[PDB]
């Protein structure tokens, strides 16, 4: 085996933060040197272990997610950080082992200004847990007085979208973000190279 990060990164279409994805990769090898040293990715932030020892250190099964996030709120991907996309879109376990990689790619999705193909949910009951999504596109209950069940006032439609102008200020370019989470089970380790 050779572990397909080319069929991860060189994909063309990415999801949105309300409908972020998963994919599990197993029985492959570790070749993170090209990811480190290609220098086409601006960000390589993570905690715990140091990248100089992940070409031998390995686990039993790894996971990956691929979707685009606002660049003015990149600190909101952390174990225990406040915010709103750190509230209703993607959570992380507190004792964190995996690693997050990001970069700026405002050339392919630098479309005509005001384009809002990618959305984000603003209002949801209470809190989040890691490792589950929200496909409930239903209109949420702000209605202490029950308005309709259909959208009205005293009640809101919480699914607002982004904006991608090729001359925006600094925080609205579409930075793609991936996370490669490490987790350990009873099974023997499988995913590493030399």
């Amino acid at each position: 085996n050779l572990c397909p990060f080319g069929e991860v990164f060189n994909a063309t279409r990415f999801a949105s933060v309300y409908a972020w994805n998963r994919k599990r990769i197993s029985n492959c090898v570790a070749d993170y040197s090209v990811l480190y040293n290609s220098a086409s990715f601006s960000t390589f932030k993570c905690y715990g272990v140091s990248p100089t020892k992940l070409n031998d250190l390995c686990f039993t099964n790894v996971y990956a997610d691929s979707f685009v996030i606002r660049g003015d709120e990149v600190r909101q991907i952390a174990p225990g950080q406040t915010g709103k996309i750190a509230d209703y879109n993607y959570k992380l376990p507190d004792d964190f082992t995996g690693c997050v990689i990001a970069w700026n790619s405002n050339n392919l999705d630098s479309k005509v200004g005001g384009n809002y193909n990618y959305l984000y949910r603003l209002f949801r009951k209470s809190n989040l847990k890691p490792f589950e999504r929200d496909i409930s596109t239903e209109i949420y209950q702000a209605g202490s007085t029950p308005c309709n069940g259909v959208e009205g006032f005293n009640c809101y439609f919480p699914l607002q979208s982004y904006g991608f102008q090729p001359t925006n200020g600094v925080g609205y370019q579409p930075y793609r973000v991936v996370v490669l989470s490490f987790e350990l089970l009873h099974a023997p380790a499988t995913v590493c190279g030399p």
Partner: antibody
Framework: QMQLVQSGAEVKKPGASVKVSCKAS????????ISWVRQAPGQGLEWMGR???????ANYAQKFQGRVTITADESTSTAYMELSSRSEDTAVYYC????????????????WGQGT | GDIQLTQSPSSLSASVGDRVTITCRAS??????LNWYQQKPGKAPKLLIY???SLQSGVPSRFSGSGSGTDFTLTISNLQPEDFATYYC?????????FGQGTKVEIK
């Protein structure tokens, strides 16, 4: 820059199916949350429901609870309203528009049909 | 559940440069969201005033609109023959979308 075609006049017997076209061209698409509005000759307007091509979430009013259907297509960029009902509901076929913003106004703003 | 909408008075008789005000009413505390429309026979009802308190681009400062709570007022100064058509109320507090019964102004 934008218009929706006018379907020809027809006389339908009760129980017959009805096909209508509402072209959504021009500007940036997926901008307005498409709806539909009916009226009778000599009577006021009435509202039925809402369609968004991004999600397709159903909306239906009281006089058409589970009776009339809402379908659409992004690629052809056309709204579709089909019904199997009587002949006393025939009139001009106005297809509504208007952007349902989030945290802002949700009015049917402009850009409707000039006819059937 | 469903709001009821009314428009008063039903028919208005007017001449050049008169004063007319639409008395619209409902049965709920409509905070800000209401719209008005103009209907000549042969078209879709074009916008006159959006949000009941704001002026839409493409409409001059001839038309005016305000109001909050339950009672709303509509103002046109120096009326013109192209303004002589049927009016409409349009609240947007909640659903279903209710509509006015129509108000026709015709020249003496």
């Amino acid at each position: 820059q934008m218009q929706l075609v006018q379907s020809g006049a027809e006389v339908k017997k009760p129980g017959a199916s009805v096909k209508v076209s509402c072209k959504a061209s021009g500007y940036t698409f997926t901008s307005y949350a498409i709806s539909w509005v009916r009226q009778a000759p000599g009577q006021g307007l009435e509202w039925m429901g809402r369609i968004i091509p991004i999600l397709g979430i159903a909306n239906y009013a009281q006089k058409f609870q589970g009776r009339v259907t809402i379908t659409a297509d992004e690629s052809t960029s056309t709204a579709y309203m089909e019904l199997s009902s009587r002949s006393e509901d025939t009139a001009v076929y106005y297809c509504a528009s208007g952007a349902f913003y989030y945290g802002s106004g949700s009015y049917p703003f402009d850009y409707w049909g000039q006819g059937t | 559940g469903d709001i009821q909408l009314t428009q008063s008075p039903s028919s208005l008789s007017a001449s050049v440069g008169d004063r007319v005000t639409i008395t619209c009413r409902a049965s709920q505390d409509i905070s800000d969201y209401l719209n008005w429309y103009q209907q000549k026979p042969g078209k879709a009802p074009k916008l006159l005033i959006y949000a009941a308190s704001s002026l839409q681009s493409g409409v001059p400062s001839r038309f005016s609109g305000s109001g909050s709570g339950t009672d709303f007022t509509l103002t046109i100064s120096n009326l013109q023959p192209e303004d002589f058509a049927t009016y409409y109320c349009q609240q947007s507090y909640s659903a279903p979308r209710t509509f006015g019964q129509g108000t026709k102004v015709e020249i003496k």
